Amino acid sequence: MHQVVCATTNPAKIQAILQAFHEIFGEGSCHIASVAVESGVPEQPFGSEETRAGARNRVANARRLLPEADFWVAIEAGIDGDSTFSWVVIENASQRGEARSATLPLPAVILEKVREGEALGPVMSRYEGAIGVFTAGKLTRASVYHQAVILALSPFHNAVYS
Amino acid sequence: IMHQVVCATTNPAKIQAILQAFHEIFGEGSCHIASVAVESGVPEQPFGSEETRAGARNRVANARRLLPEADFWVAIEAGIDGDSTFSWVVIENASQRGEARSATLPLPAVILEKVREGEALGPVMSRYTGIDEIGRKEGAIGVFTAGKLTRASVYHQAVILALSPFHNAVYS
């Protein structure tokens, strides 16, 4: 089996990573474990680049802490000038794979409130993630993370990426 | 009630994704589809978030011009963002606008290299896979995810996310 380390202790993300990894490498061919590391980025990353940078920082930290594993993966959430989304970064001994998730346009009021100091979690909590509430249940956070992990997994099963 | 949805595209994979999203949000057998071919007002191969987004908006506007008595107008435009490919979904109705980006797909350096040299993604992919009109079928998504995902599957979620404003009063 492949030893896959997830730089997150969130069940939704853990679930998506496992599913995505099993779909590409085969059912039951992967063992997943979590490691809690620093993102070197603010709790609520702003902008595509900063959110992705955190994902990368988490992978580097996880990779150094557990050098025995085969894969290191992170999924970092962040907000835009009008939306929320996340970045998936994957690494193994040889290469890296990165992918940004689908975007969720956010209510004007919700946006200005997080732009005033509060984290999205609190503004939504005090008000599955936000995806579930706005897609009337038709989509789950795990469901969009999943597609993202599968995409960033591309380089690892296509020799063309060299 | 019953919605008249105009898709600013003829791409069967896109229409499939649109139709599915609307049924899931508004209910099966509640949306009649009408597809039209229109201009994007942007290059064959758009680059950047801004340019590809502009394409999708122009398509919707153009479509709205031709069939102004419809309820919804939707469009999906693909583009290159950094070392990957993705697309914007733009939706408009009588008084609102909803937009969302689909998940991105990282491309091999050899393909990007060929694309940045001047070739659009579809033709490059056609000589790598031998498949004609890849974008109207499984797409580069289907090829690099080994069928685990398809252009339709990925765009489906993006259309769901873009519909949010239309069924959630909060977006006021």
Summarize the structure.
Chain A: This is Inosine/xanthosine triphosphatase. The structure is a homodimer. By secondary structure, chain A is an alpha/beta fold.
Topology:
Two copies of one chain form a homodimer.
Chain A: E1 2-6, H1 11-25, E2 30-34, H2 48-65, E3 71-79, E4 83-92, E5 96-100, E6 104-105, H3 108-114, H4 120-125, H5 129-134, H6 141-152
Parallel strand pairs in A: 1-2, 1-3
Antiparallel strand pairs in A: 3-4, 4-5, 4-6
Helix pairs in contact in A: 1-6
Enzyme class (chain B): hydrolase
Family (chain B): Belongs to the YjjX NTPase family.
EC number (chain B): 3.6.1.73
Provide structural commentary.
Chain A: It comes from Escherichia coli (strain K12). Chain A: Its EC number is 3.6.1.73. Chain A: It catalyses: XTP + H2O = XDP + phosphate + H(+); ITP + H2O = IDP + phosphate + H(+). The structure is a homodimer. The first copy, chain A, is globular. Chain A has 162 residues and is α/β, with parallel strands linked by helices. The two termini of chain A are 23 Å apart. In chain A, helix 1 packs across helix 6. Chain A has one domain: Maf protein (Alpha-Beta Complex). In chain A, strands 1, 2, 3, 4, 5 and 6 form a six-stranded mixed β-sheet that branches. Chain A contains six helices and six strands. At the A-B interface, strand 5, strand 6, helix 3 and helix 6 of A face strand 5, strand 6, helix 3 and helix 6 of B.
